[PDB]
From a paper:
In natural photosynthesis, the light-driven splitting of water into electrons, protons and molecular oxygen forms the first step of the solar-to-chemical energy conversion process. The reaction takes place in photosystem II, where the Mn4CaO5 cluster first stores four oxidizing equivalents, the S0 to S4 intermediate states in the Kok cycle, sequentially generated by photochemical charge separations in the reaction center and then catalyzes the O–O bond formation chemistry. Here, we report room temperature snapshots by serial femtosecond X-ray crystallography to provide structural insights into the final reaction step of Kok’s photosynthetic water oxidation cycle, the S3→[S4]→S0 transition where O2 is formed and Kok’s water oxidation clock is reset. Our data reveal a complex sequence of events, which occur over micro- to milliseconds, comprising changes at the Mn4CaO5 cluster, its ligands and water pathways as well as controlled proton release through the hydrogen-bonding network of the Cl1 channel.
At 1,200 μs, the Ox omit map density is below the 2.5σ threshold, indicating that a predominant fraction of Ox has shifted from its original position in the cluster. The contraction of the Mn1–Mn4 and Mn1–Mn3 distances starting at this time point suggests that the onset of O2 release happens around this time. A comparison of these omit map densities within the OEC with that of the O2 atom, which is believed to not play a prominent role in the S3→S0 step, shows that the reduction of the density is specific to these five atoms (W1–W4 and O5) and Ox. The overlap of the O5, W2 and W3 densities is no longer observed at 1,200 μs. Once O2 is released, refilling of the cluster with a new substrate water seems to occur immediately. At 1,200 μs, the D1-E65 residue rotates toward W40 for the second time during this transition, accompanied by a shortening of the W42–D1-E65 distance by 0.4 Å. Thus, a hydrogen bond network from the OEC to the D1-E65/D2-E312 region, similar to what we observed at 500 μs, is reformed at this time point.
Author numbering:
A (entry chain J): 5 to 40
B (entry chain F): 12 to 45
C (entry chain A): 11 to 344
D (entry chain C): 32 to 473
E (entry chain D): 12 to 352
F (entry chain E): 3 to 84
G (entry chain V): 1 to 137
The structure:
């Protein structure tokens, strides 16, 4: 029902989004689309 | 006494399921060399 | 009862048809100077050597312009950022040729509009209101500062400020795109979102309130007569509006607190236009839109064009043609 | 009664916790100063100009004279390391006091000590805290004078021989020069205080400011506001915040123009050329190129009828032609040898251009402060290749943004302070609506 | 109480997402237009229709990905999956631009479904349908720009492609070829969009700064109750402020909210009309009197003539790459260029 | 205020929800990844690989120039890379 | 298309010997070119003197011909004008002038071959784009 505290779910989800967006921004500098 | 499978359930998964699959595919793309 | 206190009481009086105020004391003379000179110049000013290459551009109606092509033309590139009041010219003829009227209008205007913001605070205080309407007005004011003052400062010359005319505005935004790729700058992108979204929310709020007016008139009358100025009770049913709009999307995607809703109405376009004023102001210092030209290449190293490269072709066409005679050296660095 | 999103307003009358807020926040500023320096040093490559390396803190240190020698070359990176290390260490001390006064220390101070406790409405105590800080600031300004005069000097881009670190023995004390700057027009060719172009005036200015701040510190400790000041201001915490916000915004706009135009206290060897400088450099570059080919640059008529390379300013000075006519107020050490009393000197241009001037002009034109948000150097139409955005553009844009918002925060908090003080910041009293008791306008 | 009335019961039940009879049209069509865009920007090229990379798979970022128009050679083909061009081959369908008509056509039908939805929900809840009416403006813009405009030209290829940068190229195209900034119908649209933005900000701020004090907290949001009959701000004080600041002010609360509907809706309708003329190259490109004077008088120059020089540069420098099917070859010596640049 | 569905905040904090979705979410993520890393995505959609935009000496776009011969033109372009 | 050994095969000297760089060297040279040369030579043009580009046909008509590894490595040590008449180490970067052009200090002899190799390979990939300027962007 309310086992996992909602603030803990909000932090991990938030960190998970940061991880993926950071990966996409790293990829603008490497591989395809980097200009190199 | 709540249902699990509703119209709402369907709409949510209709969007969320392909969204994650697509995020996986785009993630893999960052490691592609020319 | 002392003569000065009598004057102060008139200046700050809440009974004047138009509020004056201490800010009004600066605003009225400066806005009249700028208005009178703009009208006279728009109708009659002779051609102005905006680019300092002895190539006058004709801006006024009497010199062969219509409403759409007419402009008060920016001052000569030979002047740069130098102050050029009337009394620094050898004659009004010289002052007209070199674009004196533009400096006079924009300086008086910027002062008067800044005081207009101040006056919005001031009357709000005399009337016992909350103070922040002037904070909303600072977004258009900042935008006027960006194109008339900040951008000339970064590029070294008032001749690159925005011309006071309809066609001149378009010239300014065409030249801006080539030189700065503003379409690819996120602060212009947020500005579009502020303005598109502003119009959207304006239409939504107008249509939701209008949709839920309480029946108060007959079919032979304008529903508008259902509201009497200063009546105490609301004139529409927000529960019905919320009930409609929540079901249009879903429940929690809809406002039921009118104070939250109207604050949202204020914030969105104001913040969007802050950013777009800031975009112009930072592109004043040549920090330009994203540049993805030739960012995609194949395994051998062929360039694979994207839409960004097509934009670049269009930008190139603007660059090579603008001010076609004013460049002696291969780089247009300002 | 503030919402969570206005949470820090809850500290307004809790002087103990508000102290820790301020002191911990001061730890964040010193922390960032320490870490950014160590980051910049870890990435620094001495064979490259600083302005090709996205550095903004090392150039401030080099300008103070540490780490550099003749021509601006980095000769020793240990001063950079130390400044970064000492700042970082110090941020822990401030962070320590910050969180102690925020969580464990006395929630309010005025019960614990009448010295450190304060009430915002106490015009005496407020001016006394102002006075202490004015003196600290005055000492701060004198610390720069000390460094310039007794501890190795400052980097001087105008020093003969290409620039060097020079000890300032004769700071300008003449008030006609010091305050003369403050009365110059801010318009082109004049530039108000942004025109200061020599370290003697710089150091002399800080002697004056140091003394004025210390004199003013002592004045405000010994006095209380006169009656005319008392009826002119709002006397409350938010009102004081609003005043400082206005002041910071003004300061930020000035800094923006300082870094964009001034090449003395922001030497171009470290920060790269200014906008006007790079544009003048291009004109010089092709003058040199064409004249080596045999072009008579003095008599060459360009397409408009104006000289292709050289023309007159509106007051007659010989200047560079083309669009850079707008930039003829630029002054820089690589250009000034060519100036005679009437402007650029045609006989010096034909005979005295040195290779180091050709090198410098080529360097500066190819490093103009133009670039894209993702750091592609050049005009907007340039293809990927050069990773470069001038520190001058990064510094000018960021501080315009900050200056603008602090002006908005000034408006926000000044209007609110006025309304709070008069009793209607929460809305109109339905039973006593001022407009309802006024005659109608018509 | 037959089967129709039973289905009607089920379609119209109060649930987290209301369905209705219009959901049968709206929800599949809205989901497929969206799904097609995301599919195409992630995986699909524009190499054969345009000579462009346009997907994340190819190295494009969010700003440069697009679902691009079909090739000019397709004319105005419906480009059905099962039609003569792709002949049921899903891969060829993607390579020929079939996702564009798929997105544009399903999108059109989705917008119909959404407007039907606004009508349906308004009828059930019992309010007037002015929100449906206001939504006519985005419809006119969609169909005039994505459907009527390319149908007037040679092919879908000249419609907007669905992407951030691709839309930006569409803006510049309209300047260089149609001189669209000069068009009075666009100017009316600009006035309507900026006018709406203005109204939105000024009405939100006025309400927020003429609030009645209805609670003791410094957060004034809590002091409102959605069932209260009393107005939450003073219309009287707001009228006085604007009358003295600006000279005029609203006095009728219904007129103000109707005016907020009217201004941006009308602006969009006007801009739509001007695009219809551009479908036929019926531009407002020139002022004839200007051209006659300028041709005869080489010292007469205006901001009008200056912009057409810019338009000529745009056309000549972008056309070869932007219209690859025409095989434009412009040698260097014919390109319009000012001095030095 | 409620239409009878289960509140979202109650679900995403329920352990049963996280028992199911700590599998389903990464499985879908992995699935999409393999769609790309095995190269299937290129073949389903016809998107050129970095080496298959041009022939080795080719400088010309393989632009579709016919309406009803379009399907065959692409096929002819593609075999000129084998 | 891809980076084949035929693409990576460039002249070594004026006597028609060839050399085949590896993918490594090519990317090495491109990196080094961007670090030391591209501020003036982006795209194979010359910003501070547009009359002289890095096209193979221009390099072949320089005195000392410079359309080969040897001529290029020599140029980066002791640059001259297009007719070979005067040395220009004091206004053009080179190892002879690494004291005044400090980015040239840390370039080893193999770095010079990669840079030279990059300059000769690139017009084979980009054709007219290399040295053509904004007309071909
Ligand atoms: C209290 C209320 C205050 C009310 C005051 C009322 C009068 C205010 C006037 C403000 C308008 C100023 C216009 C600035 C014009 C300009 O040339 O300004 C730039 C000048 C610097 O001038 C330049 O100064 C240069 C100094 O460099 C010279 O000296 C250098 C020394 O190394 C170098 O050698 C260089 O080569 C050489 O040229 C040259 O002289 C240039 O010719 C000259 O243009 O900066 C300045 O004086 C510094 C300050 C400028 C701040 C203006 C920013 C305005 C921000 C408004 C934001 C609006 C907010 C939005 C509201 C919503
Ligand atoms: C509003 C509320 C919301 C409603 C939205 C509902 C969404 C429904 C979506 C509508 C579907 C649109 C289908 C349009 C296809 C079309 O037209 O397809 C175009 C074809 C005609 O085909 C074109 O025909 C052209 C002319 O051909 C002729 O000329 C050639 C040159 O001589 C040769 O002779 C050739 O053989 C000969 O046929 C060219 O060949 C083009 O390449 C080819 O595409 O017409 C046809 O299908 C039919 C033509 C007549 C039907 C007219 C339908 C109305 C649409 C036109 C309205 C826009 C008006 C345009 C002016 C603006
Ligand atoms: C010295 C600077 C200073 C100080 C000390 C204060 C102090 C205060 N302000 Mg003022 N303010 C300032 C500058 C300052 N302000 C500026 C520059 C602006 C203009 C934007 C404002 C605008 C402003 C408004 C509009 C309001 C205040 C309010 C308040 C009070 C509550 C603030 C609070 O709890 O925020 C809590 C903090 C937050 C909610 C975080 C804000 C998040 C920001 C916007 C995002 C920043 C991220 C940045 C852009 C980078 C992005 C990175 C990404 C990873 C996030 C407090 C007395 C409130 C008030 O009046 O109280 C009396 C109020 O309503 N402030
Ligand atoms: C510069 C940033 C800054 C600073 C210094 C503060 C400081 C403070 N805030 Mg504010 N606040 C901020 C930003 C900031 N805030 C923002 C962005 C928001 C919007 C979300 C708020 C919203 C907010 C609200 C809503 C409230 C405060 C309150 C407070 C005070 C009490 C907080 C407390 O006891 O928490 C208790 C928290 C903890 C015990 C958690 C641990 C926190 C510790 C200190 C973190 C330290 C980390 C670091 C590793 C320490 C190393 C120590 C080492 C150096 C020795 C305190 C002075 C409260 C107040 O005014 O009370 C009267 C209050 O109600 N703040
Ligand atoms: C401006 C910031 C500031 C202010 C106003 C205060 C004020 C106060 N603190 Mg806090 N404190 C601060 C910073 C500050 N502190 C910092 C940075 C730390 C971490 C080291 C602490 C840690 C701290 C503790 C642990 C305690 C206090 C306590 C107190 C109270 C009594 C202090 C006393 O009698 O000292 C009298 C004066 C002295 C002891 C002489 C101090 C001279 C200093 C050290 C030299 C000057 C420093 C110099 C100018 C700047 C550094 C140079 C550097 C750049 C190289 C008082 C309300 C006490 C309290 O209230 O308990 C309930 C207490 O227990 N403070
Ligand atoms: C952080 C700095 C600071 C601050 C906030 C204050 C704040 C205050 N001072 Mg102190 N003061 C300071 C530094 C400071 N002072 C220093 C360093 C000195 C020594 C010179 C003094 C000397 C001093 C005296 C002698 C007096 C004050 C007084 C006051 C009070 C009224 C101020 C007032 O009316 O300003 C409003 C300002 C004006 C009405 C005139 C402004 C004139 C300027 C020059 C206009 C130009 C502005 C322009 C836009 C920018 C260009 C600069 C220009 C010079 C070209 C107030 C409490 C008064 C008081 O009550 O004392 C107890 C008073 O009589 N101060
Ligand atoms: C209500 C939902 C809806 C609507 C309005 C559309 C509308 C459209 N779709 Mg989309 N589609 C939908 C749902 C929908 N689709 C769903 C759920 C899917 C997933 C499978 C798709 C997948 C899809 C694809 C893959 C494609 C379309 C295409 C199209 C377009 C052409 C349709 C056409 O010619 O139909 C023709 C068929 C009919 C009109 C059926 C009418 C039935 C009549 C009334 C009865 C006939 C009796 C019967 C046949 C007799 C049998 C004979 C007996 C002897 C055996 C059109 C815009 C095409 C497109 O966009 O290309 C650009 C296309 O390629 N659709
Ligand atoms: C190739 C062709 C592809 C086309 C295929 C077209 C098929 C699409 C049909 C999608 C309809 C899905 C709705 C049914 C989902 C569901 O579980 O609800 C019905 C079941 C029980 O859910 C019930 O949910 C009810 C609430 S609600 O109606 O779901 O909102 C509640 O009343 C009840 O107690 C509960 O048991
Ligand atoms: C109050 C509060 C808050 C805030 C907080 C803060 C802000 C704090 C601060 C803090 C701080 C500000 C901290 C800092 C720290 C620091 C430190 C801890 C340091 C350390 C150092 C070191 C350890 C170093 C080392 C080294 C050396 C020596 C050399 C080189 C190398 C190295 C670098 C490694 C919040 C909002 C959250 C919440 C509420 C309340
Ligand atoms: C260091 C230096 C220098 C010097 C400087 C100086 C010396 C400074 C000074 C400065 C100053 C000396 C300043 C001043 C200031 C002022 C101001 C800024 C003012 C303010 C005001 C106000 C704001 C007011 C307001 C009001 C009014 C008007 C009315 C009533 C109300 C009130 C009060 C509010 C130089 C340059 C040489 C060089 C470099 C370094
Ligand atoms: C076409 C087609 C189709 C359809 C399909 C579909 C239905 C699809 C879908 C798909 C999908 C449905 C997709 C999705 C995806 C998504 C994604 C890819 C997302 C992403 C996002 C993101 C990246 C975000 C981020 C962020 C931000 C930015 C900010 C805030 C935070 C966040 C995190 C939110 C079919 C089969 C019928 C058949 C025919 C063809
Ligand atoms: Cl132009
Ligand atoms: Cl020029
Ligand atoms: Fe409203």
């Amino acid at each position: 029902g309310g086992r996992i505290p909602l603030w803990i779910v909000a932090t991990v989800a938030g960190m998970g989004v940061i991880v993926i967006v950071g990966l996409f921004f790293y990829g603008a500098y490497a591989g395809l689309g980097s200009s190199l | 006494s709540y249902p699990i499978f509703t119209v709402r359930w369907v709409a949510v998964h209709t969007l969320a399921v392909p969204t994650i699959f697509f995020l996986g595919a785009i993630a893999a793309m960052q490691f592609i060399q020319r | 009862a002392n003569l000065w206190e009598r004057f102060c009481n008139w200046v700050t009086s809440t009974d004047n048809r138009l509020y004056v105020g201490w800010f009004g004391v600066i605003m009225i003379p400066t806005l009249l100077a700028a208005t009178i000179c703009f009208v006279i110049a728009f109708i009659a000013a002779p051609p102005v050597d905006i680019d300092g290459i002895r190539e006058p551009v004709s801006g006024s109606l009497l010199y062969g312009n219509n409403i759409i092509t007419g402009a008060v033309v920016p001052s000569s590139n030979a002047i740069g950022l130098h102050f050029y009041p009337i009394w620094e010219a050898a004659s009004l003829d010289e002052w007209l040729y070199n674009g004196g009227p533009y400096q006079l209008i924009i300086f008086h205007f910027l002062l008067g509009a800044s005081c207009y913001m101040g006056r919005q605070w001031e009357l709000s205080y005399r009337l016992g209101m909350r103070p922040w309407i002037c904070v909303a007005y600072s977004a258009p004011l900042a935008s006027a500062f960006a194109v008339f003052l900040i951008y000339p400062i970064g590029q070294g010359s008032f001749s690159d400020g925005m011309p006071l005319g309809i066609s001149g505005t378009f010239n300014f935004m065409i030249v801006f795109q080539a030189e700065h790729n503003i379409l690819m700058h996120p602060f212009h992108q947020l500005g579009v979102a502020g303005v598109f979204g502003g119009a959207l929310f304006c239409a939504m709020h107008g249509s939701l309130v209008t949709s839920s007016l309480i029946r108060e008139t007959t079919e032979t009358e304008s529903a508008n007569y259902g509201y009497k100025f200063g009546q105490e009770e609301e004139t529409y049913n927000i529960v019905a509006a919320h009930g409609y709009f929540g079901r249009l999307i879903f429940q929690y995607a809809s406002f039921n607190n009118s104070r939250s809703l109207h604050f949202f109405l204020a914030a969105w376009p104001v913040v969007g236009v802050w950013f777009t004023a800031l975009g112009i102001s930072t592109m004043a210092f040549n920090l330009n839109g994203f540049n993805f030209n030739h960012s995609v290449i194949d395994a051998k190293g062929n360039v694979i064009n994207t839409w960004a490269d097509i934009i670049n072709r269009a930008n190139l066409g603007m660059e090579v043609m603008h001010e076609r005679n004013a460049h002696n050296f291969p780089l247009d660095l300002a | 009664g503030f919402a969570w999103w206005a949470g820090n307003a809850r500290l307004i009358n809790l002087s103990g916790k508000l102290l820790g807020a301020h002191v911990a926040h001061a730890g964040l500023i010193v922390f960032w100063a320490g870490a950014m320096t160590l980051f910049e040093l870890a990435h620094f490559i001495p064979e490259k100009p600083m302005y090709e390396q996205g550095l903004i803190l090392i150039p401030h240190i080099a300008t103070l004279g540490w780490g550099v020698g003749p021509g601006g070359e980095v000769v020793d990176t240990f001063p950079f390391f130390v400044v970064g290390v000492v700042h970082l260490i110090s941020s822990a001390v401030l962070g320590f006091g910050g969180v102690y006064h925020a969580i464990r220390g006395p929630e309010t101070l005025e019960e614990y000590s009448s010295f450190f406790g304060y009430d915002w409405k106490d015009k005496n105590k407020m001016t006394t805290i102002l006075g202490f800080h004015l003196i600290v600031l005055g000492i701060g300004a004198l610390l720069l004078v000390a460094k310039a005069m007794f501890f190795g000097g400052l980097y001087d881009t105008w020093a003969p021989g290409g620039g060097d670190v020079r000890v300032i023995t004769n700071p300008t004390l003449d008030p006609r020069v010091i305050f003369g700057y403050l009365l110059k027009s801010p318009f082109g060719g004049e530039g108000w205080i942004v025109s200061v172009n020599n370290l003697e005036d710089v150091v002399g200015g800080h002697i004056w400011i140091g003394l004025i701040c210390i004199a003013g510190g002592i004045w405000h400790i010994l006095t209380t506001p006169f009656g005319w000041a008392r009826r002119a201001f709002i006397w409350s915490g938010e009102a004081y915040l609003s005043y400082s916000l206005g002041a910071l915004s003004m300061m930020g706009f000035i800094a923006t123009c300082f870094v964009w135009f001034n090449n003395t206290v922001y030497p171009s060897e470290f920060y790269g050329p200014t906008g006007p400088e790079a544009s003048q450099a291009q004109a010089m570059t092709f003058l040199i190129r064409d004249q080596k080919l045999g072009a008579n640059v003095g008599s060459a008529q360009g397409p408009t009828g104006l000289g292709k390379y050289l023309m007159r300013s509106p007051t007659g000075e010989i200047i560079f032609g083309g669009e850079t006519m707008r930039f003829w107020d630029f002054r820089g050490p690589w250009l000034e040898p060519l100036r005679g009393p009437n402007g650029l000197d045609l006989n010096k241009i034909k005979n005295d251009i040195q290779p180091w001037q050709e090198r410098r002009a080529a360097e500066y034109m190819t490093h103009a402060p133009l670039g894209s948000l993702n750091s592609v150097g050049g005009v907007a139409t340039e293809i990927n290749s050069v990773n470069f955005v001038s520190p001058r553009s990064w510094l000018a844009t960021s501080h315009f943004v900050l200056a603008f918002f602090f002006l908005v925060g000034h408006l926000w908090h000044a209007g609110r302070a006025r309304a709070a003080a008069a009793g209607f910041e929460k809305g109109i009293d339905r039973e006593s609506e001022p407009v309802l008791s006024m005659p109608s306008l018509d | 109480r037959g089967w129709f009335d039973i289905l009607d019961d089920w379609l119209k039940r109060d649930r987290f997402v209301f369905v209705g009879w219009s959901g049968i049209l709206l929800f599949p069509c809205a989901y497929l237009a969206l799904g097609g865009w995301l599919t195409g920007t992630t995986f699909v090229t524009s190499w054969y229709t345009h000579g462009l990379a346009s997907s994340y798979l190819e190295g494009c970022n969010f700003l440069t990905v697009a679902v691009s128009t079909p090739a000019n050679s397709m004319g105005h083909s419906l480009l059905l999956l099962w039609g003569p061009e792709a002949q049921g081959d899903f891969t060829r369908w993607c390579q020929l631009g079939g996702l564009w008509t798929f997105i544009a056509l399903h999108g059109a039908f989705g917008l119909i479904g959404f407007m039907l939805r606004q009508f349906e929900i308004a009828r059930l809840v019992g309010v007037r349908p002015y929100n449906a009416i206001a939504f006519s403006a985005p419809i006119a813009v969609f169909v005039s720009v994505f459907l009527i405009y390319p149908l007037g030209q040679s092919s879908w290829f000249f419609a907007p492609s669905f992407g951030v940068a691709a839309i930006f190229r569409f803006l510049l195209f309209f300047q260089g070829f149609h001189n669209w900034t000069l068009n009075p119908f666009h100017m009316m649209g600009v006035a309507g969009v900026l006018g709406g933005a203005l109204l939105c900000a000024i009405h939100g701020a006025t309400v927020e700064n003429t609030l009645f004090q209805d609670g003791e907290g410094a957060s004034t949001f809590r002091a409102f109750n959605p069932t209260q009959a009393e107005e939450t701000y003073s219309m009287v004080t707001a009228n006085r402020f604007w009358s003295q600041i600006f000279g005029i002010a609203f006095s009728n609360k219904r007129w103000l909210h109707f005016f907020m509907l009217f201004v941006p809706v009308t602006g969009l309708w006007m801009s739509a009309i001007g695009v219809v003329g551009l479908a036929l190259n019926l531009r407002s490109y020139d002022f004839i009197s200007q051209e006659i004077r300028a041709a005869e008088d080489p010292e007469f120059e205006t901001f009008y003539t200056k912009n057409l020089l810019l338009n000529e540069g745009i056309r000549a420098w972008m056309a070869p790459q932007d219209q690859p099917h025409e095989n434009f070859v412009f040698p260097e010596e014919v390109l319009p260029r000012g001095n030095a640049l | 205020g409620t239409t009878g569905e289960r509140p979202f905040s109650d679900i995403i904090t329920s352990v049963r929800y996280w028992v199911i979705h700590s599998i389903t979410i990464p499985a879908l993520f992995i699935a999409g990844w393999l769609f790309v890393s095995t190269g299937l995505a290129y073949d389903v959609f016809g998107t050129p690989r970095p080496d298959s935009y041009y022939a080795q000496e080719q400088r010309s776009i393989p632009l579709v120039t016919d309406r009803f011969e379009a399907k065959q033109q692409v096929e002819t372009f593609l075999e000129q890379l084998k | 298309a891809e980076l084949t050994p035929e693409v990576l095969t460039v002249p070594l000297n004026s006597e028609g010997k060839t050399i085949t760089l590896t993918e490594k060297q090519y990317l090495e040279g491109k990196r080094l070119f961007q670090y030391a040369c591209a501020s003036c030579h982006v795209g194979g043009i010359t910003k501070t003197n547009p009359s002289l580009d890095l096209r193979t046909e221009t390099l072949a008509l320089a005195t000392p011909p410079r359309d080969n590894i040897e001529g290029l490595v020599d140029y980066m040590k002791n640059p001259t004008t297009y007719d070979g008449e005067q040395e220009i180490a004091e206004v053009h970067p080179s190892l002879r002038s690494a004291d005044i052009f400090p980015k040239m200090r840390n370039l080893t002899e193999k770095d010079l071959v990669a840079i030279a190799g990059h300059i000769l390979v690139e017009p084979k990939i980009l054709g007219d784009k290399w040295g053509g300027g904004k007309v071909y962007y």
